[PDB]
A = this chain, B = another copy of it.
Amino acid sequence: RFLKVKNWETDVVLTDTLHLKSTLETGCTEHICMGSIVLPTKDQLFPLAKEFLDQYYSSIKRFGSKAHMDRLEEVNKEIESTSTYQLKDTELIYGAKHAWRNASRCVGRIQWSKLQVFDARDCTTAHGMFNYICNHVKYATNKGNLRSAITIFPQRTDGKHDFRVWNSQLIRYAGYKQPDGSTLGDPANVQFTEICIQQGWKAPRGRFDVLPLLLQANGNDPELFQIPPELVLEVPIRHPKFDWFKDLGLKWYGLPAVSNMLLEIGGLEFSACPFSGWYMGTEIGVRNYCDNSRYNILEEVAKKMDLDMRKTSSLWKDQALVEINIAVLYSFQSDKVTIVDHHSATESFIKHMENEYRCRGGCPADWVWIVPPMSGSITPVFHQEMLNYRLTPSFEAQPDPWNTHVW
């Protein structure tokens, strides 16, 4: 019931108590662990509300107070006659910061309390959403000096009136199948690119074409908008030693803004809640550039370095991997766009973990995701035992809207 996490590098042992306050289920059983699997009504709602409001009132040290009890009553009466309820702004701000605080896959949580929250619950149309999203992008980009933020559209009602952003990120590059057999652009985005073109998009058909927004309001058919080009900050990728690097014509965008997840606060579900922070180098350099299913540039780079690609054992893949990541980091710093490297990102998470154990009694963490996709054991997180569990408020994955929505 009390659980120890040990760090095998520092021999430091922490004690987790926070997991007993966990509520959702993990995928794992006593027989079978699924740690590595990417995807493992009116009554129902009130305890969810009570659970949240209790923790909120506890956070502002007013637990049991009259103001506490009165909200609990108000919310209770709102649910009975309306079937749902509305969060107070203070409650919304708290809920969002905490969904982030609870995101066990996020290495970046030391930042969790500096979250700018934009209340877009007054939004009614897809046009509304487009305005709110541009202002989010502009505010978050902040001329390169990135600031973390979330925009929160109206909550689910009866499920046939959902707000949704169809893109998986606010900013992404198209993917087109070609007569060749090859893929041009980002292969991760083929299906979505095809949904856009069929929904009317004039696709330019290049390699780094910024995709349009596909925005759905009040459960209506999704509509299309182009982000103002002058709002999408992008970075050309060069290497500090390799002059030839620029000639791959590689670029990435500054703002990572996850747009496809679902925010749950006190039983209420926000289905469109784009949020953003900033990149950890390896996200672009290792995954976006090197995944076989992504831009897949290892072969090309190694060939420019004139490494012996005749055998795996020369570590030519590993050599080229490091330099691709040097270039990402160097390009972002040279243009003064915020980026953090994986040594510094994990160092920061270790410190935040220690803080969470000291001040909250634990920190849910998904080691599989927290450990960077390169150089795992030279980052401290690798040696850090972690306990994974699901707390609420939370961000969840949710079915791509096209599989479910009807026209």
Binding site for B on A (CB under 8 A): 3, 5-6, 8-9, 19, 22, 25-38, 281, 286-287, 290-293, 298, 312-315, 317-319, 321-322, 325-326, 329, 333, 341, 343-344, 366-368, 371-378, 382-389
Contacts and interface: CB of A to CB of B under 8 A. Distances in A.
Closest 3 CB pairs of A and B: A35-B35, A373-B377, A36-B367
Contact of A373 (B34, B298, B376): B376
A314 B293 CA distance: 27
Given A26-B28, A33-B388, A35-B28, A333 B313 contact: yes
Nearest to A281: B313
Nearest to A3: B32
B377 A374 contact: yes
Contact of A29 (B5, B26, B314, B325): B26
A9 B290 CA distance: 11
A343 B382 CA distance: 20
Contact of A315 (B313, B322, B373): B322
Nearest to A327: B315
Contact of A35 (B33, B287, B314): B33
A386 B371 CA distance: 17
Given A38-B6, A313-B329, A30 B31 contact: no
Contacts of A31: 19, 22, 25-26, 389
Q: Which of A27, A281, A313 has the most CB of B within 10 A?
A: A313
Given A28-B35, A31-B389, A341 B321 contact: no
A385 B387 CA distance: 19
A375 B292 contact: no
Given A22-B31, A25-B30, A36 B386 contact: yes
Contact of A375 (B25, B30, B321): B321
Contact of A377 (B27, B290, B314, B388): B290
A323 to B, nearest CB: 8
Q: Which of A26, A27, A281 has the most CB of B within 10 A?
A: A26
A14 to B, nearest CB: 12
B33 A375 contact: no
Given A32-B388, A367-B36, A293 B9 contact: yes
Q: Which of A19, A31, A372, A389 has the most CB of B within 10 A?
A: A31
Contact of A325 (B19, B315, B383): B315
Nearest to A325: B315
A377 B374 CA distance: 7
Contacts of A8: 38, 293
A326 B344 contact: no
A355 B378 CA distance: 33
B322 A378 contact: no
11 contacts: A8-B38, A22-B31, A25-B30, A26-B29, A26-B32, A28-B33, A36-B385, A313-B341, A318-B322, A373-B382, A374-B374
Contacts of A376: 371-374, 376
A38 B326 contact: no
Q: Which of A29, A35, A341 has the most CB of B within 10 A?
A: A35
Contacts of A26: 28-33
Contacts of A22: 31-32
Contacts of A371: 376
Contact of A387 (B32, B292, B329, B383): B32
Contacts of A366: 33
Contacts of A38: 6, 8, 385
A30 B40 CA distance: 11
B19 A32 contact: yes
Given A28-B28, A34-B387, 17 more contacts: A22-B32, A28-B32, A31-B389, A32-B387, A33-B34, A36-B384, A286-B378, A290-B377, A290-B378, A291-B383, A312-B343, A313-B343, A318-B325, A318-B375, A319-B326, A367-B368, A373-B382
